Automatic annotation (TrEMBL):
Residues 33-302 form the Glycoside hydrolase family domain. GO terms for biological process: cell wall organization; cellulose catabolic process; glycogen biosynthetic process. This is Glycoside hydrolase superfamily. The keyword Hydrolase applies. The lineage of its organism: Eukaryota, Fungi, Dikarya, Ascomycota, Pezizomycotina. Residues 343-431 form the Carbohydrate binding X2 domain. Disulfide bonds join 3-141. It comes from Aspergillus oryzae (strain 3.042) (Yellow koji mold). InterPro entries: Carbo-bd_X2, GH, Glyco_hydro_5, Glyco_hydro_5_endoGlcnase_B, Glycosyl_hydrolase_5, Ig-like_fold, Ig_E-set. Keywords: Carbohydrate metabolism, Cell wall biogenesis/degradation, Cellulose degradation, Glycosidase, Hydrolase, Polysaccharide degradation, Signal.
């Protein structure tokens, strides 16, 4: 390959500084078999106008190559139309002034999984080398704003696996260097096992005689329970929560003291996480990437953050937090005690149908900013000292003001919200919610009658149309799954896990087919308690469904 442009060489350190912060074009070129095969339509270039406008400096471009080969051994030819598609999307990004990182993505487990017992490691190496030679050839003449990343989250359980991941980095470096063009001075992102901080620290080794400018990329989706909505965890922000996060990043940095580091994916998704906890978490994560000189890139699958059809960011507070890391954020406080028998959140003003409208006081973590103004979502700035007062860290809304937004009898649902403008940092949003205890169309079912598939139960949402968690208890008191949640306090004991065991959609709460098969195996009627926000206690805002055996 021969290039006719110029190339502005950049060090890995300067590249990693320049890309902070990044955003992922998730579930697109990484979707299988085609870019519109999952939830997102065909990629359109205005999507990158929105990303640029929000303050991101870079776009990570996950690409899954598995379903775009037109031959197998020994050439492993990639469809030139797919290589052209990847090339053109990269051009969409860099022509708007955004840096790019492009990779090999779900290939990692679809065919390149070195941990499977039947894996032919020779063929994996061979196909991987051909793939990166062809990618590197097609992309050889891209500017220095385009970096290459070895492979996404490669499955890796043992040090023997970790040597094979090191070999991936070497095969990759050799392929792109033979491809030529500008690749010898192109910034690259090398990877460790599962892209996990500990596996990387344990087994990653710099490729001998490396000459590309290089950075290490890892992903961070901890703590599991909050990020994946496991075991009823719906809070984040205690001293130990922060210590676990700060430690995980610091032990990684402590093993790679002079290596530029890219945090290539993270996300407390607005779809499943509670906002006040989510904002404390994103705030603390950004603070920690700044402590340990890491550049973060948020994961967004198309439904998490940006709506690409409208340009609306579903969670504007998180985006502000991530794109303005030099600024201190004032945040709504929230319960962070797992032993607390009630959970509160200053990201919300909650009112129950059929109760009187009362004053509501929301504690905030001001972090030495001042409150400048508040504005509702209809465009009205509220009147300070009439519509709200400030006392210390507390923001109080009087009952007479709130009674202009809801009453004892108005319908349950989402009402206007309030955007709080502070001296500096992000502008948090307080969502008014009129809520009641949801009802279900059905209260029991035989498990035998409804197996082979998920169980969808129609529901009348009354307030937030989201599920917080599901408790599952056999008739004799044994937990349906995961006995160890008995140590997780009043809101965690006997609770089950999002997507694995339960879900929800617009009209239904859902028990998965695996959940149903667990009941049949237990041989015992099981009570499912669907639990909703607010989590004022363990029973009030909840409804039961019994699977019979
Ligand atoms: C969705 O479904 C779930 C599951 O079906 C529903 O949950 C269930 O709700 C019912 C109803 O609320 C609960 O019943 C209560 O149980 C109380 C004891 O609970 C504890 O023990 C049980 C049993 O444990 C054994 O069995 C299990 C097998 O499953 C074994 O594993 C275990 O080892 C034991 O062997 C436990 O199951 C229970 O666990 C739950 O809670 C713990 C604690 O957090 C959780 O960790 C668990 O995960 C689980 O969630 C717990 O360990 C029992 O005390 C209580 O009986 C009193 O109250 C009754 C109702 O009183 C109200 O109504 C009356 C009018 O009818 C009013 O007068 C009254 O004031 C009140 O308003 C009374 O009818 C009854 O007589 C008892 O009254 C006494 O106590 C009252 C409360 O103080 C007093 O007000 C009374 O005056 C009276 O006091 C007098 O008597 C006592 C005792 O004699 C004296 O001490 C006292 O001094 C005084 O003289 C009730 O039976 C059930 O526990 C719960 N089950 C589960 C699994 O959660 C859920 O509601 C539903 N949700 C929805 C939204 O629909
Ligand atoms: C505070 O309160 C605020 C006020 O209530 C609240 O704001 C609301 O926030 C929600 C969520 O962020 C917004 O909902 C989205 O609305 C999108 C459409 O918006 C346009 O049309 C609306 C109706 O007329 C207008 O209200 C809106 O006007 C506003 O915005 C303009 C742009 O700034 C502005 O110019 C206007 O003046 C005005 O300010 C706008 O014109 C809608 O597209 C979006 O739906 C997607 O996301 C849902 C999940 O949130 C999905 O369920 C849904 O299916 C859509 O996702 C699909 O499409 C995506 C894009 O392609 C894909 O990536 C997805 O995967 C998914 O794909 C499926 O469907 C495709 C077909 O569509 C198909 O191709 C795929 O195969 C797949 O099947 C969402 O509903 C709402 O607009 C906001 N309201 C207002 C008034 O602003 C705010 O959230 C509150 N703040 C906080 C912090 O709580
Ligand atoms: C670089 O990255 C690595 C990987 O993350 C970091 O190493 C890890 O550090 C943490 C914190 O110091 C360690 O956690 C502790 O683990 C001990 C048990 O350690 C023993 O068992 C391990 C399991 O196989 C083994 O890996 C260890 O081997 C190391 O240590 C020996 C002896 O020093 C040494 O000879 C080896 O060569 C290895 O270096 C070891 O044999 C456990 O007892 C601890 O519990 C205490 O602390 C926690 C902290 O909160 C507390 O909660 C408990 O109550 C208890 O008080 C603790 O969990 C982890 O084991 C280390 N992992 C490895 C593989 O070494 C390393 O710190 C990073 N370096 C820098 C500079 O940041
Ligand atoms: C902020 O708001 C909380 C809640 O109203 C206040 O805490 C309460 O203080 C009174 C004492 O005046 C106690 O009786 C309550 O039990 C407290 N409630 C709690 C701790 O949840 C707090 O004082 C307020 N701070 C201000 C106004 O500066
Ligand atoms: C593994 O694949 C290579 C290349 O496709 C092939 O030559 C080799 O014989 C295979 N080995 C086994 C054990 O199947
Ligand atoms: C409850 O029933 C399950 C059903 O398999 C059984 O495994 C468990 O031992 C039982 N526990 C008690 C306390 O009865
Ligand atoms: C969370 O904190 C609030 C404080 O406003 C309480 O009212 C609630 O019961 C929970 O403790």
């Amino acid at each position: 390959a021969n290039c006719t442009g110029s190339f502005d060489a950049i060090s890995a350190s300067d590249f990693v500084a320049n890309i902070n912060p990044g955003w992922n074009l998730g579930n697109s070129l990484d979707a299988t078999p085609n870019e519109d095969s999952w939830n997102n339509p065909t990629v359109q270039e205005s999507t990158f106008d929105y990303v640029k406008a929000a303050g991101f400096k870079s776009v990570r471009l996950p690409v899954t190559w598995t379903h775009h080969f037109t031959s197998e051994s020994p050439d492993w030819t990639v469809d030139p139309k797919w290589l052209q598609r990847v090339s053109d999307v990269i051009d969409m990004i860099t022509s708007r002034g955004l840096y790019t990182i492009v990779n090999v993505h779900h290939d990692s487990w679809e065919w390149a999984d070195v941990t499977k017992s039947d894996a032919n490691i020779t063929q994996i190496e061979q196909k991987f080398e051909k793939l990166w030679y062809q990618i590197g050839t097609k992309l050889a003449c891209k500017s220095s704003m385009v970096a290459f990343e070895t492979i996404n989250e490669p499955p890796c359980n043992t040090a023997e696996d970790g040597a094979k991941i090191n070999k991936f980095n070497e095969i990759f470096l050799r392929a792109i260097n033979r491809a030529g063009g500008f690749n010898a001075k192109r910034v690259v992102n090398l990877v460790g096992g599962g892209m996990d901080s500990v596996k990387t620290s344990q087994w990653f080794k710099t490729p001998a005689n490396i000459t590309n400018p290089w950075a290490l990329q890892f992903h961070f989706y901890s703590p599991y329970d909050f990020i994946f909505s496991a075991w009823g965890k719906t809070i984040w922000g205690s001293d130990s929560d922060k210590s676990e996060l700060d430690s995980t990043l610091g032990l990684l940095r402590g093993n790679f003291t002079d290596v530029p580091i890219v945090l290539g994916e993270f996300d407390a998704s607005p779809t499943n996480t509670e906002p006040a906890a989510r904002w404390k978490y994103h705030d603390y994560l950004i603070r920690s990437t700044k402590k340990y000189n890491m550049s973060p890139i948020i994961w967004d699958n198309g439904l998490d953050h940006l709506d690409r059809s409208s340009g609306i960011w579903r969670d504007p507070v998180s985006i502000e937090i991530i794109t303005n890391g030099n600024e201190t954020n004032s945040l709504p406080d929230s319960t962070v005690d797992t032993s607390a028998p009630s959970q509160s959140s200053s990201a919300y003003i909650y009112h129950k149908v059929g109760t009187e409208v009362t004053d509501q006081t929301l504690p905030f973590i001001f972090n030495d900013n001042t409150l400048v103004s508040i504005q509702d979502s209809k465009g009205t700035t509220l009147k300070a000292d009439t519509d709200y007062t400030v006392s210390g860290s507390n923001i109080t809304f009087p009952a007479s003001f709130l009674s202009t937004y809801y009453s004892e009898t108005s319908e349950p649902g989402l009402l206007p919200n309030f955007t709080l403008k502070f001296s500096s940092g992000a502008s948090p949003v307080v969502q008014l919610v009129q809520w009641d205890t949801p009802t279900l169309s059905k209260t029991s079912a035989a498990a035998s009658s409804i197996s082979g598939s998920d169980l969808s139960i129609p529901i009348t949402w009354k307030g937030l149309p989201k599920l917080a968690t599901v408790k599952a208890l056999l008739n004799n008191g044994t937990y349906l799954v995961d006995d160890f949640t008995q140590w997780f306090g009043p809101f965690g004991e006997a609770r089950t896990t999002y997507s694995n065991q339960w879900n929800w959609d617009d009209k239904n709460v859902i028990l998965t087919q695996a959940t149903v098969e667990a009941v049949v195996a237990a041989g015992q009627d099981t009570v499912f308690t669907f639990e909703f926000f607010p989590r004022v206690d363990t029973t009030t805002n909840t409804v039961n469904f019994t699977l019979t055996v």
